[PDB]
Write an enzyme that holds these catalytic residues in place. Structure first.
Site, PDB file in Angstrom:
ATOM      1  N   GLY A 105     101.064  91.955 111.253  1.00  0.00           N
ATOM      2  CA  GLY A 105      99.611  91.973 111.050  1.00  0.00           C
ATOM      3  C   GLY A 105      99.188  92.619 109.732  1.00  0.00           C
ATOM      4  N   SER A 124     105.023  90.670 115.611  1.00  0.00           N
ATOM      5  CA  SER A 124     103.644  91.151 115.915  1.00  0.00           C
ATOM      6  C   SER A 124     102.718  89.948 115.946  1.00  0.00           C
ATOM      7  CB  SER A 124     103.306  92.230 114.892  1.00  0.00           C
ATOM      8  OG  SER A 124     101.967  92.636 115.009  1.00  0.00           O
ATOM      9  N   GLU A 166     108.670  91.197 119.039  1.00  0.00           N
ATOM     10  CA  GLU A 166     107.595  92.113 119.475  1.00  0.00           C
ATOM     11  C   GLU A 166     106.227  91.431 119.428  1.00  0.00           C
ATOM     12  OE1 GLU A 166     108.174  96.160 117.937  1.00  0.00           O
ATOM     13  OE2 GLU A 166     110.033  96.303 119.137  1.00  0.00           O
ATOM     14  N   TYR A 171      92.087  92.094 114.125  1.00  0.00           N
ATOM     15  CA  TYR A 171      93.335  91.713 114.860  1.00  0.00           C
ATOM     16  C   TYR A 171      93.429  92.266 116.285  1.00  0.00           C
ATOM     17  CZ  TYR A 171      95.618  89.319 110.881  1.00  0.00           C
ATOM     18  OH  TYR A 171      95.994  88.408 109.912  1.00  0.00           O
ATOM     19  N   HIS A 189     109.488  98.201 115.056  1.00  0.00           N
ATOM     20  CA  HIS A 189     108.534  97.098 114.808  1.00  0.00           C
ATOM     21  C   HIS A 189     108.810  96.406 113.484  1.00  0.00           C
ATOM     22  CE1 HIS A 189     104.981  95.175 116.391  1.00  0.00           C
ATOM     23  NE2 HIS A 189     104.233  95.452 115.309  1.00  0.00           N
TER      24      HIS A 189
END
Ligand code: C1U
Ligand code: C1U
Ligand code: K
Ligand code: K
Lengths: 268, 269
Positions: free
Chosen positions: A32, A102, A126, A187, A242
């Site tokens: 993101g 993401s 993820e 987001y 992440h």
């Protein structure tokens, strides 16, 4: 050997993008934060195995900031998938392997389901399917508090490697500083409900390879493991949390190359 | 009032056990460290909801240390299940809900599959199915080196709550210090290969509820989530890591009570 350039698509976006290599196309969609310099080391390692690797900053983020407000507000997986197809069209990439983490993960699953003739195989990492009120609630804060809160989350909570995270450098962290408020406002409230994993049977038999970070707390992406297993989709772990392409770039590059090679074998 | 007593079984074990309450039986099987004081707050909370709660130290560990060497060497889930059935026979507990974490998780799944008439339902937490060479390798060190290393691992890597773990207190930690070498020499090389979750179809439709710690790194019990999902077994999370009954005793007690209640309803249905 890296091309670093811009391209304009008829949805109004002027993208910053990078390319390296010759061969089957591999596309690295950012998370993101929308910052493709996070892939720098891995782009060269992947391209060196005989691939054309393309990556880009996401609309409204970093060097792709020349974009209309609809591309970085009320963002969904389906909007992002449409934007990625617009840049692939502009770059004449007809058939691509895609990676994303993401919101990038939601994007690549939406690409595989929505545009199957375009996508050789998708690697998702993820994928967010849950609203988290504590991140949704950053959207109403002042820009400086959002940047301070989220910079600390990335460095100390989910980087999977604080020294590699800091080593992205001053220029990248200056871009991320400006991206945090755009991400917060556009987001977390809209990406999770748009997750393209409501229909488990639509995922079954698709060329999808799913990962979670080995060190990520179980709670964070527990639902990804359950969903992948229910669908019979390959599910495994990458080191770190992440940002495996930041924390463990060589492992990440090897995963992307080996997974692409497996699907090139299966395709023939 | 809590019974705190000992009872001997014909396999040679003298068990230390505790019991509180009246009602349907719930039995709390310790993790590999075999220390039932870890359940002290939860036993009262669960018993107060209308259950007879039993727990005990495991053979060779803590206050159950008077036991033959076979009961704490080359330990498997199936050996532990046979020992737990022996104490349930000794206490005239005919039908029980069982909880277990770690080697206790392997034990309660072995109990449910092997003694279906005795087990109402089983709750398993963080069931070990993989050999870890760094834990198997402690077994050849000196006792004091094992205790120092494993005390630090428990506090810093898997307690789920350093304050609560330390607040177990000197008496408990002095018992654990003596247990670490027994566990290291008897458990980690033989427990994982004994995991009774290799036959996925044998788990399907069984009264099993599986949990992993919310804060546990995903790698640690990834395989439990996969296995449970493949078998259609209820799978979810508890707060903390490996010792939810220490880190989050009230959440743990509520989980045990609500899960037991769910199966009492289904049993009548
Ligand atoms: C159980 C956990 O450990 C609790 C802390 C979780 C926190 O550290 C995750 C930080 C990265 C956030 C991803 C995310 C979150 C959100 O609310 C909406 C989204 O769209 C995203 C996304 O797009 O990736
Ligand atoms: C990827 C992860 O983070 C790596 C670190 C995992 C480590 O910190 C957890 C320590 C808890 C072990 C319980 C256990 C384990 C075993 O292999 C055999 C057993 O018999 C038991 C038992 O008896 O309780
Ligand atoms: K690496
Ligand atoms: K609690």
């Amino acid at each position: 050997m890296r091309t670093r350039s811009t391209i304009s698509t008829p949805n109004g976006i002027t993208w910053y993008y990078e390319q390296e290599g010759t061969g089957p196309d591999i596309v690295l969609v950012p998370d993101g934060l929308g910052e493709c310099q996070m892939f720098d080391s891995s782009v060269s390692q992947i391209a060196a195995q005989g691939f054309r690797v393309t990556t880009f900053d996401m609309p409204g983020m970093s060097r792709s900031a020349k974009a209309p407000a609809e591309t970085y507000t009320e963002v969904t997986a389906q909007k992002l998938a449409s934007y990625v197809i617009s840049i692939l069209d502009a770059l004449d990439i007809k058939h691509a392997t895609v990676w994303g983490c993401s919101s990038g993960a939601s994007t690549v699953v939406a690409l595989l389901l929505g545009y199957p003739d375009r996508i050789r195989n998708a690697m998702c990492h993820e994928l967010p399917t849950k609203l988290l009120d504590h991140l949704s609630n950053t959207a109403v804060l002042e820009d400086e508090e959002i940047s301070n809160i989220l910079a600390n989350v990335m460095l100390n909570d989910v980087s999977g490697g604080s020294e590699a995270w800091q080593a992205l450098g001053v220029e990248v962290h200056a871009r991320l500083h400006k991206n945090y408020p755009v991400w917060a406002r556009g987001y977390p409230r809209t990406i999770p409900p748009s997750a393209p994993v409501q229909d488990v049977e639509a995922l079954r038999g698709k060329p999808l390879d799913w990962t979670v970070g080995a060190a990520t707390p179980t709670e964070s992406f527990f639902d990804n493991i359950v969903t992948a297993t229910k669908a019979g989709v390959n599910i495994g772990l990458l080191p770190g949390m992440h940002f495996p392409y930041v924390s463990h770039p060589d492992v990440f590059a090897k995963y992307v190359v080996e997974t692409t090679q497996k699907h090139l074998w299966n395709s023939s």
